[PDB]
Structures are given as structure tokens and as C-alpha cells.
Design a protein around this ligand. Structure first.
Ligand SMILES: Cc1nc(-c2cccc(F)c2O)n(CCc2ccccc2)c(=O)c1Cc1ccccc1
Length: 273
């Protein structure tokens, strides 16, 4: 069974999730939409792997739908929108952290350092919960983002680590509690740059990990869920690698075509000079 401390820990994480995860995206509005040297550009074409169409269902019953263009200087038409969605998600993640007592008690410098290290990872973890793996679409209330079908199909889509990560994590069919513990483990990473209380964060991380392992042991006896704890930890390590690569991806794009919002600039360390 879970201890009283472990049950309290999960409850506080679920409470935070409940309060700060707008699962229907109802307060996401007033966002931008697409209109109605050489080596750096070629690497920036990295964007092709993440191609998505966009659907917006109106409250009145109307449906707007956007198919993006082929590559060739207009592969940036969707960046402002994605910047606005990412920003909206980041705010939710920041609120999540701030309502957790284990995070509130850390020094303000470590709070910021932990948020800059983990914001992308937490975003992806929340996005996985609205991912429909059958249709390859993220369902964000009135908005939907659907992967565009390419020559290799389902196989070729899994070559992009981000996309493969979303498919693999969804296949584990995790509970809400397991997702929120993944968020905690990722948030409380003692080895992010600029962390001062490395011992406290490490100990906290271990308690979340132990709580997740015990939750799984107590609630998932089936042969399918053997090694689930270790599969989850391997996915978080993978996600951290995806984070570092996609961070460099976004910074390269930002160098050629500015798109990052002020909040994104904060989290990515862009000063404005
Ligand atoms: C598929 C995907 N891809 C990217 C992503 C896109 C371009 C470059 C990257 F390096 C990327 O990682 N991003 C990152 C967020 C982003 C921030 C700034 C600008 C564009 C996007 C994602 O989160 C997702 C998941 C998702 C799917 C559908 C709706 C929302 C999210």
C-alpha cells in the first residue's frame, strides 16, 4: 500500500493539476493565425518533420481548417500561433509549479532554474494527455492539430523523436496520477543548470520516484504493466534529450526569424539585447 505521506503527495499534485490544467483550452483565445547562412536555413528546415494542419471549431458550429504549404521562405507561417499556444501552456505549467508546496519552499532562484529546465518537458507531458494516437491529432478543445500524412506513413512519423515519444507514452495508457508524478519528477531535477539546492531537489525527486513506483506496484498488477515504472523513467530521460535538441532547434529558428514571446524569451534566457 501507499503510505500517508505518499497519498498526501499525490493529492497535492492532482490538486495542482486540476487547478492549472485547462483541459478544454477554453481560456486560450486572442491568438495569432497564419495569413489568409544557407547552411543555417537548411538546418532550420528541421521544421518539416513536425508538420501539422489546424482546425478551429466555432461555438456557433462553424469549422475553419488550415493546411500548411510545401517548403519553398514561408515555412514560418505557423510559428506565431504555436508561440501563442506554447505560451498559454507555459503559463499553466508555471501556475502548476507555484501551487505545489514542495516547489514554493525552494529559493526563488532555484524555482526559476527548475522552470527553465523543465517547462518544455511538462508541456509535452500535458500535450500527451490530449493526444489521440489513432488519428495522430492533439485535441485542444475547439482547436485540433493533426499530423499531415507523408510518404512513409505511420512508420516515417515515428522517426521524429518527439512524435515517437508521444506515440510510445500514449501506448502505456497511464493514469492521471502517473502523468502528474512524471511532471513532478521532471520538474524537480537536481541537475539543471543554475540549481543551488541540489541535495534538497534530489531528495524530493527520489520521493516522487518512490511514490510513482509504489503507486504502480499497488494499482497495476497485470502482466502488461510489468516494468512500467522503469519504462516511465526511460521515457523521461528520453524527453530530457528531446528537450535539449528542440531547444537548440528553436534557438536556431529564432536567430533567422524572431517568433518567441516575452515569456518564451524568459524561459529560454533571451535578454532582449
Ligand atoms: C509537434 C510539436 N512540435 C513542436 C516544434 C515545432 C517546431 C520546432 C520545434 F523544435 C518543435 O519542438 N512543438 C514545440 C512547441 C513550439 C514552440 C514554438 C514554436 C513552435 C512549436 C511541440 O510542442 C509539438 C507538439 C505539439 C503538437 C501540436 C500542438 C502543440 C504542440
Amino acid at each position: 500500500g501507499l503510505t500517508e505521506e505518499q497519498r498526501m503527495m499525490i493529492r497535492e499534485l492532482m490538486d495542482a493539476q486540476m487547478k492549472t490544467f485547462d483541459t478544454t483550452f477554453s481560456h486560450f483565445k486572442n491568438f495569432r493565425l497564419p495569413g489568409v547562412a544557407a547552411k543555417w536555413s537548411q538546418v532550420r528546415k528541421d521544421l518539416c518533420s513536425l508538420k501539422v494542419s489546424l482546425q478551429l471549431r466555432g461555438e456557433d458550429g462553424s469549422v475553419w481548417n488550415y493546411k500548411p504549404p510545401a517548403d519553398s521562405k514561408e515555412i514560418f507561417s505557423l510559428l506565431p500561433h504555436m508561440a501563442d499556444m506554447s505560451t498559454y501552456m507555459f503559463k499553466g505549467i508555471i501556475s502548476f509549479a507555484k501551487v505545489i508546496s514542495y516547489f514554493r519552499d525552494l529559493p526563488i532562484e532555484d524555482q526559476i532554474s527548475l522552470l527553465k529546465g523543465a517547462a518544455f518537458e511538462l508541456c509535452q507531458l500535458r500535450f500527451n494527455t490530449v493526444f489521440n494516437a489513432e488519428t495522430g491529432t492533439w485535441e485542444c478543445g475547439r482547436l485540433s492539430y493533426c499530423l499531415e500524412d507523408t510518404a512513409g506513413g505511420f512508420q516515417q512519423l515515428l522517426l521524429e523523436p518527439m512524435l515517437k515519444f508521444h506515440y510510445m507514452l500514449k501506448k502505456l495508457q497511464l493514469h492521471e496520477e502517473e502523468y502528474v508524478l512524471m511532471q513532478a519528477i521532471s520538474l524537480f531535477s537536481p541537475d539543471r543548470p543554475g540549481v543551488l539546492q541540489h541535495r534538497v531537489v534530489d531528495q524530493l525527486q527520489e520521493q516522487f520516484a518512490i511514490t510513482l513506483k509504489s503507486y504502480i506496484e499497488c494499482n497495476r498488477p497485470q502482466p502488461a504493466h510489468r516494468f512500467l515504472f522503469l519504462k516511465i523513467m526511460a521515457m523521461l530521460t528520453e524527453l530530457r534529450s528531446i528537450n535539449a535538441q528542440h531547444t537548440q532547434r528553436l534557438l536556431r529558428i529564432q536567430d533567422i526569424h524572431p517568433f518567441a514571446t516575452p515569456l518564451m524569451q524568459e524561459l529560454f534566457g533571451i535578454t532582449g539585447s
